[PDB]
Design a protein around this ligand. Sequence first.
Ligand SMILES: [Zn+2]
Ligand SMILES: [Zn+2]
Lengths: 857, 573
Amino acid sequence: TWEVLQYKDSGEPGVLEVFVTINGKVQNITFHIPKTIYMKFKSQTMPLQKIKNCLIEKSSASLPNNPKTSAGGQLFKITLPESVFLEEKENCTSIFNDENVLGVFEGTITPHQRAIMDLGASVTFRSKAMGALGKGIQQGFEMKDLSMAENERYLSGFSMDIGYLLHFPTSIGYEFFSLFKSWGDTITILVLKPSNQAQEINASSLGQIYKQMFEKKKGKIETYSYLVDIKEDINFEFVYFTDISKLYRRLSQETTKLKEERGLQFLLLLQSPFITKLLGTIRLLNQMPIVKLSLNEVLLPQLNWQPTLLKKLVNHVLSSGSWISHLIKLSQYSNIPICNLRLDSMDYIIDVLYARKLKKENIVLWWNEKAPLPDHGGIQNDFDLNTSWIMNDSEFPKINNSGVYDNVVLDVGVDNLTVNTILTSALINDFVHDAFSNDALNVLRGMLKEWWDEALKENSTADLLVNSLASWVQNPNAKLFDGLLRYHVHNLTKKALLQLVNEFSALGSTIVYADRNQILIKTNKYSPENCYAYSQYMMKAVRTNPMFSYLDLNIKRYWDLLIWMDKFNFSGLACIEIEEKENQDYTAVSQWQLKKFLSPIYQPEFEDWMMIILDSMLKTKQSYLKLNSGVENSLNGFSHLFSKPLMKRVKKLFKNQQEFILDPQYEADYVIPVLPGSHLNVKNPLLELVKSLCHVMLLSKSTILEIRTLRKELLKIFELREFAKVAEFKDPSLSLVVPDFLCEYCFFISDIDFCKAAPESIFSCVRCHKAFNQVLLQEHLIQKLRSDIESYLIQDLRCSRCHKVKRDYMSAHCPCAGAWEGTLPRESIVQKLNVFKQVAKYYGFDILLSCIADLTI
Amino acid sequence: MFGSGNVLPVKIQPPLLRPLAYRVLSRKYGLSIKSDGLSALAEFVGTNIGANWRQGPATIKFLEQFAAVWKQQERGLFIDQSGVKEVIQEMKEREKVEWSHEHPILDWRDYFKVINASQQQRFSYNPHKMQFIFVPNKKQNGLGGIAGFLPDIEDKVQMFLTRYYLTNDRVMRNENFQSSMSITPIKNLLGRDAQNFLLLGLLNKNFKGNWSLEDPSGSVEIDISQTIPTQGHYYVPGCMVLVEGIYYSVGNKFHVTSMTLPPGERREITLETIGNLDLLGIHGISNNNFIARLDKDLKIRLHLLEKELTDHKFVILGANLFLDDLKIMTALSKILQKLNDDPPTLLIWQGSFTSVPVFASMSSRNISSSTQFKNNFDALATLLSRFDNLTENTTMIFIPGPNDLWGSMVSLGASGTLPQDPIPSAFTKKINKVCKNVVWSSNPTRIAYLSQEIVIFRDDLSGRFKRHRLEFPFNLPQKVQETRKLVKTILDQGHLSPFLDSLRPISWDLDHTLTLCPIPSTMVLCDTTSAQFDLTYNGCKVINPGSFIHNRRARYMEYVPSSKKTIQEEIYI
Ligand SMILES: [Zn+2]
Ligand SMILES: [Zn+2]
């Protein structure tokens, strides 16, 4: 057999350089593959006058249905070599520059990725009719000579040494090159410095770093030490430069000597942020077969970074082997060459396996490499309101029900929601212009069923595919990012969440909050000790449901007595696990973002009174339950317990308010803070505190009369009426949400709110607690701003009276004689842009500040 | 310039200028003098004269000239210190021309300017006032959030009717309709059974999916079975076309015999119809009370000095040049060395600067795509640091491509809003540390070079025109023929992109830039889907380089404006 290591792009059209192995020897062979395109014509007639060496056939496959074309023609499949494709590219009399052209599907497919899809990682030749194999060796091999082979024999075991090269960029501006020899006994480090006055010599410290990690990673190397490396005890060499120009020449000599050390029988693990510039600067690596991993930029301080960076170098050197074995295990199932697959981006294997099944099912790909838009026959890059609506709108409708709850409020975490949604598409549904092609979605649904069935056999590769499909769909970087596909999955996710709400409501349980992961529901029970078996019965009954059988529902927290506003404003009493305890190991959680819109003297008093409110509510609920058991809830009459201290406390606070607000010594405690969500202006801080307390007490649907009388009595001391303009409550945070921002580590797809969340939970993941870079956050705010601006500029105009959409595109007024007004308000966009300016001024997004600067000019 | 003064300047004051202020120009010519303008006049008389300001007749003659010049512009009844500065600079130019008249022996930088789509003055037509009217810019007015990128809600309604009445004026001015038939508004047609009518209509597809013609008075459905279209033209939805045919009242349909576009008019015809309005603002700026008038003698003098300057060249690269490709980098280095042999006047750089669209990726370990854009501009500045002659003697103009950072952030490389804004300044600051004078302009760019108005536009016109062309049942080199069809369609519309709003949106407040009611003398459409060409039509020059690479060759242009001549030069890469 011929197991393939690397498919390699070349400067020649249609010619690729292929590195395979035979008997442990790395063979390099030039390969010629013609390109196949799909051509849509105006009519059924074929004008083919004289075209040199081209196969033109009729094709029976439907097309990706973009909404602007959803005539009397036929699809045709044309195979021709890429060089002669360039020969009739320049001829305007050819069929490729015809005026009867409707579309050119799959015209941008490279020979490299086509050879990846068609031939797999295991290729064999056919010798039924072959004059000379050597004539095929220098003259190249055609695809009619080749076919697939067995996947398991691919990289069973290689007796071949690795060459490990890393580039380190630092935050202080230093540059590092490192070269490893498994056959040699040297690790070589090239270090750049701006000046020779800066000191970084740590050879004895590097030896001590190696001695520190030696016992630490001895137990970790030994899992794969019998295959990937011979001797782990090698010596350290270093060289220093103050410039970069001769540093390329030194690296070129030190990498050229590897070629004479081994003789073209080793692969290179290359990890640098720059690849094309690297292969431009140094030459012999370009012919060399390379496995690639894009490396994160190392962020290091000005001093004491040196043991950290040497620790990192030893960590990569001693942890390369498990990564290499994981590449082998990935390539065993993925049927992709080890050099050509990207381990760092999991979407490539998803795209090529998907496109393999698409090509198996006789349907035209929308494989587009160098643009997130699909091919769609080449009639893309044209604006349409349909594709702008289904590609622009990313909004997950949360179901929020504010109030106080005395039932055992259950927190369930929903995992694989997107996967369980897209897998059971045949059960959710139990000419459309904005619909994805149905047969391709049947292909993906069956493929995900196969992946899920293989995942139960503990295939970690298939586990990684089924956990990475949800990130593959959302990613525009992938080759098959189709907006119709993503809108199909998002709309089906909305439908599946609403059906989950209906299924939980059919068991006598009303939800509190619904989201992609966290769902809070209200049961019929009062105590969790009576509610545990009922909760288990409920979750097993919804796991029994046919539409939800792949949904990972796990209980996160039991809530006994809860106050709900949204996910960012909740307080109450909770327990993680149920226990046989009289106190039940209860804890009190208060997460008010309302507290931050208050003066610093008045912030802890809000938490104090919330604690008093919570304790009085538990005491009233316990007394009512003990009295009654032996429409209004258990909480009626709870404010008789603490209104008498609260009136006196408000009057004393009012007396303190009328003394020290204007005094410059105590005014620093009385200031209002500036927050990115803040849009209101406070007039009396005690009035705002009283409004916030009476509004959180006002969320009770049962005792709203008594709370209203308490608010009426409390508003008398400020000399305000019951229903004043300033007495009513408004939310002091305007909601700025970015949709579906996912971490690369734990793949948790969440919507990040930049106004109502704490700064600690914004820049890092919610569960993984790994910090995002600020650059992509800035980029996503630019995307959200331009999405809102684009949604303003493409806009229907409606009547002020008829409320009818504008059909005749340019007219003075409607037949109902009402004026034209925008569907979006005139003030909504400028409040959105003002909140963007405020959040840019707060969090210091200088790119977003520059965007506002160029937007105003 | 001015006459030489022998003695040194002194700082004379507004005191003791009091008899020599109100009598000489405020009574003889009627111009009130403010304090700051009087102080600036005292400073300039001091610097011109010296100690003989008390008994010098040159002061009195200079103040009479000041009052006379303020009478030709009539910029205000008062006298402003900034107004004194503008009049002094115009006098320096004026006596520079007069010194060149005395001895036959200005500057091109004094009159050359660059206008983005945001900086262009707004004009709107009114047939209740029967002419044009200028609208002051609202970018300064109000909050910058309100002013920037938030147009008024009526402007979407007003945009296509403004284009309609402009097209109606351009077809009513032609000799064919001052002769053959007359244009009837569409609303009058329903009721006239079986009578022949000629129309101007916005071509549209209605909600029913049939073809329709629309005016501000209404619309009618048409059918295109019996049409005989005029050969040599392009028909796309969004065209305002002349339609001749018979209306039938049975099914409310209009049977079209022939269809054509309205005929074009030359540039000087449009300027004499408007009355020589300085639309770009080559002399000052237009205000609310007074509109800026382009002087005829000034235009003749600029044409004369334009014919005097013959060595000025405009080097135009082929569009769609990718900064990330190394072969493009090498070819750009070679052609910039060839331009380092002789630096031109302007080097207009354009095209989609990156191959991939810049999107919000999900690879936090790697450098971002915007970081890739910034690094590519830094590498461009590093290459531009090698060539001193281009950064010393040649200004450069940057036109955005369809795939640049700023516009295609949400469009993701697709068609977006038509007035594409310039590349952000924060992403390219090192270029501003290299070039002496670099202007980052919008996608429709109006540069005024002396008496010449030049429009730069980067758009893939021919692919969209061929894809949505009007197909008919009843219906010479090919590239030249399609070239003449494209240029004749674009000049007969008087619009850069005459598509519907569904095909390509236009931001509402800035459509007058894309409206080409003043036909420019020379514009450069940059269409990579079409081949390179150079034609003149209706007194306009339309030139096109296409893509940057065409079979291992880098294509560029040398356009001289004095003889109005373009040399097409290719470089074998
Ligand atoms: Zn995470
Ligand atoms: Zn109406």
